Symmetry: C2
């Protein structure tokens, strides 16, 4: 439960930075998938409309790539 958007990140960061490199630092990064977010997903945008960017869409667009948590390209960076 984040109090704000910018403040959310502060909390977010500590939480994510540790979570994703946890998988990479552990052994490897997908690298290909993250490009995918920075590529474009019909979700991250459809997200704009569905709540903080409908996580299933945006952070999922991101998780499916850089936010990192793509069970499809992982086996490395989750």
């Amino acid at each position: 439960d984040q109090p704000s958007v910018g403040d959310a990140f502060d909390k977010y960061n500590e939480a994510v930075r540790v979570f994703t490199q946890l998988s990479s630092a552990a052994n490897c990064d997908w690298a290909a998938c993250l490009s995918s977010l920075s590529a474009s997903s019909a979700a991250c945008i459809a997200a704009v409309g569905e709540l903080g960017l409908d996580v299933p869409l945006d952070l999922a667009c991101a998780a499916t790539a850089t936010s990192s948590a793509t069970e499809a390209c992982k086996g490395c960076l989750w």
Copy 2:
């Protein structure tokens, strides 16, 4: 502090989805910036290497766009 990457998201989502649409639902979304993440930032990738994708890089690549928190394109979607 997230226990895992996938589990992180569960927590994340509730936290973000509320934070970003908080700004949009409030009045408007940048829309242009979010495309920016789904576009490509030298950060989100440089992030892959600097911790869960160095928030200042990835979620900042995302915040500077879809994760949402771009004080540059905001005035709407933070």
